Structures are given as C-alpha cells and as structure tokens.
C-alpha cells in the first residue's frame, strides 16, 4: 500500500470550496488551544 | 575587436603567441583546441578562461618552427570550417535520403 | 500560485498540461505516473512539476476587492 | 517584497488644531514632473514605479502657500500595490489624513542569496 | 595523420527518428569536443522569438504585473526567427522598434460573473465570463508593411493552451508585448529547444559465455531489448546496445562481476533535440551547423 | 514490526532517448 | 470616480472637502482604483 499521496484533487477542492462544516485540518486548532483556551477561561466556564 | 593576440607573451619570431577572444567559451575554445591539436607543427596548445564572469577565451599555441601560431590558427580555424561542412553536407544528404 | 510556463530543469513547457492533467486525474481512476505519462511528462525533471504544483491561485482568488461578498 | 508606509498626516495637527495640510494641490507654482508621477488628487496612482527621489505624495500646505511633496525612502526600486484611505470609527467626521501604502519589489534570487 | 578527407571518410550520421517537434539521430566517428559544440550552440546561440518589453496598461488580477510579464514573455511563438531581423540598443526606444523586427501581442481581457450561473456550480468554467485567460488570447496584430509579409502566417503561440492568468469578475489585463529576437544564453526564454543532449552508445564486453538460466537473468538486468538468447546456442548477445541505459544492475551481482565489462564507444553519440514549437529539430541542428561555421569563419576573417 | 509497505505494481519508466 | 470602498466593495468619489466614508454603508475604509496608465515591464 502507498505511504503517502499528493492529495492534488482534495487541496484543488478545498481551494475552491472551503468547507461550510467544521474547518479541515483539526490538528492545526489543538496547536493554538493553549491560547484560545487561556482567554476563553477567563469570561466562560464555572462560576462564570 | 573581438580577437586580438597579447603582445606580453608573443613572440618576434612567431612561433609561440597568445590569443585573448571575446564572447567566446568552451563551446569554441575546445573544437578549436582539438583542431589545432590536430596540426603535428605545433607542440602546445589548450585553452583556459581566464574569469567565467567575463566573456573571455585565451588560446595559446606553441609551433615547432617554420610557422607562426597565427597561422596555425588560421588553418584551425578553416578546418573547422571545412569539418562543420562535411557535418552539415552529410546531415543534408542523410535528410533526402 | 498559478501552473509555471516552462519545466526549470530543462524547458519542456507544463504549463499547457494543468487542466489536462486535473481532468485526467479526475475523470478516470487514472494514477499520477500515468497521468504524466499521457501527458508528454517522461522525464522527472518535467514529471515532478506538474505532480507537485499547488495551485495556490484558487485560494488568491477568492479574496476579490472588486465584487459584494 | 511587500513593504507598507504610514503616511499619516497628523503629526502637527493636535486635537481640534486646524487642518494645515490637504492631500492635493494648490494654486501655487509646482513643477509637472511631480504630477507625471502623481494622481490628480496628490496620492500616487498603482502600480508606478518608485525610486529615490520620485514623490510619493503630494499636498498644498496651507501655511507656507505651497505644495508640499514626500519622497522614497530605499535605495531599492519599488512598485506601488495600493492605497488605503484611513478614516476614523468615531460618529464625528473629519478630513483625509490618514493613508496606508503597500510597495512591491522584485526580489529575484541573486548570487549571495541562502537556500 | 587527421585531414578533412580521414574524417569525411569516417563520420556519418543515422537518423533514427524524426518529427516536426523531436529529432534522435546518432553523429558517429566525430569529437566529443565538436559533438558538445554542436549541442552547447543548439541550446544557447541559436536564435529565437518572444515577447521582452511589455506594456501595461491596467492588470487588477490576483498576479503580480512582473510575475506576468515573466510569464508572457515565457511562452514560444511559432515564428520562424528569419522573417524579423535584430534589435537595437543606440537608437532611442521610440524609434528603435521597426515593422521589421517587432511582434505586438495584445491582451485585452475582462472577467464578468455569468448571470445563468447555475445551481451547485463549483467549476469555474460557468460562474464567470472569460475568468481563464490563455495563451491564445494573445492576439497577434500586424504593424505597417506587415500586412502584406506576415498574412499566410497565422502568428500564434506554440502552444495556444499554456494557462497565462486566472481572473474574477470585476478584474482586468490589458497589455501589449513587443517581441524580438534573442538567444538562449542571455535568457533562458529564448531557448528554441526543450532540451538538446546527446550519450555515448553504450558497450557490453561478454568475456565469458553466459549459458543457461544465467544468461536468463543476465538478459533480465538490461532493458528488454538489449539482451537476446541465441537460438541454437543458449547463451548470451548484445541485441541492441542503443536500447541500454546504463544501470550497472548486472554489477550487483557476483555471477557477473567478472563474466562481463560495460565500457562505452566513445565517439558515438546520440543526439536527441526536442524543439520548443519555434522551429523543427533539424532545421535546430541545421542551423547550429551553421553558427559554429559562421562563428569560426567571423573569427579567421577577423583582423588581427 | 511488519516492514514498510511496498509500492506493488511498478513498472519500467526509463527509456533511453529516442525510445 | 477613482476609488473603492473596502466593506461595500462599490465604487465612490470625494470633493477633496467631504469626509470619508462609504456611501452605502458607512465604512470609513477606501482602497485606490488602478486607473489605466501607460506601464512597461520587462518579460523576464
Ligand atoms: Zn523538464
Ligand atoms: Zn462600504
């Protein structure tokens, strides 16, 4: 089986269509959630 | 102009001299050595570029005698001329047939 | 950003092959080596041109100062 | 290259002082080289080739009764890519002071460059 | 002794292909120092078209104006090079372009968003008018006398599907690029070949013979056609050496790390020029004959 | 630990000029 | 009418005495118009 591809036909979709769901690419949103979730800690979450 | 012997290293008698060339490079410098090469009145010859930078040639050409290293490249250069057209004479023939 | 007119390496032009190559890819369950290979692309300096452009232009575009969004 | 310039035009101007300077020009003697080079208005057009000396920008200031022009500051020779008009968010409205330029430079890999 | 005669006598040429677009002819018993002169002129000092001066009079595209000039200025004109002379450098700029030496290529697009665009449409092929610009909108336009000299040419690209720039709605390009002549050593967009090489015929000294399975597997190392099995005698012959590149697989293995030489004939050169669309391969070679000639001939009757 | 899959199904790309 | 407001994205014009600001809706941003000029670049 092939280890990897050049994914050419999704990245030429996405391109032209960036999704209407939840972004591609999960794992390049977990690597900013230290700072996201920093912020969002203080006016969110329990005893508000 | 575009090819004038250096007078540092000619020679009075002749036989050995030093030609600087311009807008020229291997693609001349080497065809040209090997037809000089070719002539058994010369002992030296070989080309260097003296900065690759500057389109620059230098051929030097060292006879045995009875000739000049000016005539040594005339007649290197004619062979050229004569063997490019045996090359473009039997191409053209090779093409009919 | 957008498919280059001429190979770097040697100058067989790819950048008539783009379009060609995308509805190769697409249409039929056509591989990239044969799809370079139908395409004129049998060396790797021209195969690797047209297997590994990004197209980049697509998403340039869809950012147009001149049009309601 | 993309380089962006600031050509904010509050440096005197304070709060309520009048306004000193307005993009454009004046009735008042200015050579028409500047305006070769500049758009009827006194900002530069897009995509103009800028290098030393060539003005940028030009304004008729009111004070001295004369236009006033603003020069490159590089040594490299530039293309303009566009020109931001800046307002304020305020319900107050006020003049034109405020301009953000973006310059374009090719920036074609030399001998000396780092891969 | 080496005279013209001795080499007359010996050179030859075999054509083993040919083609409006790549030629594969074999020089055999000539220099390799003539054999790269031939190929270092084919691919730098033979003369060619395109575009170098553009002029811009609006581009609101996504590409950069240089980055599309650079592009414009890429692509091959079938042009035969000899209908428009040279360029001058003295002359002042208004007057140096000529009806003689001068090709204008306008530009004149304007992507406009199609109005029956339909339902789920992601292809850009319907939403928008004229969004793709190619090479074929490179409209070739006559100046002057070239009406009467250029009519039977139908001047256009060499390839009329190279992709030039992709547009948006709204957005413009709108230019006129003049083209001269030029070669290939001062930039590589006046190169008339795809590639221009040549490689010495391969060699395949059998010292011992190769019988049985051996020669089998021994035939599996070349390319198929390289390799054949004799009919009566099993054993092992160079079929054709041509057909070779040299791999060196058969020196991976100990059985044959002493039964066989690849050596390699070292004036027998196969050329293979792939011409850009300007011009046909042989007419290439024909005419770096002829710059070589000419170039040694300006040489000698040079004074000194 | 299984090696690393092999890319099956491979054929000859290089062919000398002219073929 | 050689200006662009960047919101609307819809032409627009000013006396050079009126303040800036869309016409449509209210955004104070504006990006130039390319006008068509006489521009030459080198094909290389
Ligand atoms: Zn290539
Ligand atoms: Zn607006």
Redesign the pocket.
């Known amino acids: 089986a092939r280890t990897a591809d050049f994914r050419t036909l999704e990245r030429e979709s996405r391109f032209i269509n960036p999704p209407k769901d939840k972004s591609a690419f999960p794992l390049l949103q977990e690597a900013v959630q230290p700072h996201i979730g920093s912020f969002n800690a203080l006016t969110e979450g329990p005893d508000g | 102009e575009k090819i004038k012997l250096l007078t540092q290293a000619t020679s009075e008698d002749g036989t050995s001299a030093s030609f600087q060339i311009v807008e020229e490079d291997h693609t001349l410098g080497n065809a040209l050595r090997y037809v000089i090469m070719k002539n058994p009145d010369v002992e030296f010859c070989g080309y260097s570029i003296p900065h690759p930078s500057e389109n620059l040639l230098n051929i030097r050409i060292q006879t045995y005698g009875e000739t000049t290293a000016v005539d040594a490249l005339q007649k290197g250069l004619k062979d050229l001329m004569d063997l490019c057209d045996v090359v473009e004479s039997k191409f053209t023939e090779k093409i009919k047939s | 950003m957008i498919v280059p007119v001429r190979c770097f390496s040697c100058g067989k032009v790819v950048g008539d092959k783009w379009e060609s190559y995308l509805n190769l890819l697409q249409e039929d369950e056509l591989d990239e080596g044969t799809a370079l290979s139908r395409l004129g692309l049998k060396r790797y300096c021209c195969r690797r041109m047209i297997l590994t452009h990004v197209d980049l232009i697509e998403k340039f575009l869809r950012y147009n100062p001149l049009e309601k969004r | 290259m993309y380089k962006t310039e600031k050509v904010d035009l509050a440096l005197n101007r304070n709060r309520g002082d009048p306004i000193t300077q307005h993009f454009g020009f004046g009735n008042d003697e200015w050579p028409k080289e500047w305006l070769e080079k500049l758009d009827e208005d006194g900002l530069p057009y897009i995509g103009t080739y800028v290098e030393e000396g060539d003005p940028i920008c030009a304004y008729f200031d009111d004070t001295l009764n004369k236009t006033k022009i603003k020069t490159y500051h590089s040594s490299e020779p530039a293309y303009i890519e566009e020109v931001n008009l800046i307002g304020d968010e305020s319900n107050k409205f006020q003049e034109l002071q405020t301009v953000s330029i973006k310059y374009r430079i090719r920036r074609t890999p030399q001998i000396g460059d780092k891969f | 002794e080496w005279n013209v005669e001795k080499f007359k006598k010996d050179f030859e040429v075999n054509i083993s292909s040919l083609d409006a677009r790549e030629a594969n002819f074999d020089l055999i018993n000539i220099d390799t120092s003539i054999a790269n002169a031939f190929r270092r002129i084919m691919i730098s000092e033979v003369p060619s078209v395109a575009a170098e001066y553009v002029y811009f009079f609006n581009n609101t595209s996504v590409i950069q104006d240089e980055v599309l000039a650079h592009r414009i200025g890429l692509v091959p004109l079938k042009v035969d090079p000899d209908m428009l002379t040279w360029v001058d450098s003295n002359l002042p700029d208004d007057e140096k372009f000529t009806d003689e030496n001068t090709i204008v290529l306008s530009l004149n697009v304007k992507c406009t968003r199609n109005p029956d665009a339909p339902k789920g449409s992601t292809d850009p092929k319907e939403l928008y008018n004229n969004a793709h610009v190619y090479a074929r909108d490179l409209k070739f336009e006559p100046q002057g006398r070239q009406s009467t000299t250029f009519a039977d040419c139908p001047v256009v690209p060499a390839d009329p599907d190279i992709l030039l720039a992709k547009l948006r709605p709204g957005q413009e390009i709108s230019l006129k690029a003049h083209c001269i002549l030029g070669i290939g050593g001062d930039h590589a967009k006046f190169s008339p070949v795809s590639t221009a090489s040549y490689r010495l015929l391969p060699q395949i000294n059998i010292l011992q013979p190769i019988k049985g399975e051996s020669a089998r597997r021994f035939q599996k190392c070349f390319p198929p056609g390289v390799i054949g099995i004799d009919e009566g005698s099993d054993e092992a012959y160079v079929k054709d050496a041509r057909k070779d590149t040299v791999s060196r697989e058969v020196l991976r293995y100990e059985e044959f790390a002493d039964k066989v030489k690849l050596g390699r004939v070292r004036n027998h050169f196969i050329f293979n020029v792939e011409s850009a669309g300007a011009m046909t391969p042989e007419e290439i070679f024909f005419k770096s004959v002829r710059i070589l000639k000419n170039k040694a001939e300006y040489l000698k009757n040079c004074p000194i | 630990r299984k090696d690393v899959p092999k890319v099956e199904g491979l054929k000859l790309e290089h062919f000398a000029t002219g073929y | 009418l050689k200006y662009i407001?960047?919101?609307?994205?819809?032409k627009l014009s000013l006396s050079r005495t009126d303040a800036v600001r869309?016409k449509?809706?209210?955004?104070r941003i504006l990006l130039k118009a390319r006008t068509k000029r006489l521009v030459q670049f080198e094909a290389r």
């Open positions: 407001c960047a919101e609307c994205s819809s869309c449509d809706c209210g955004h």
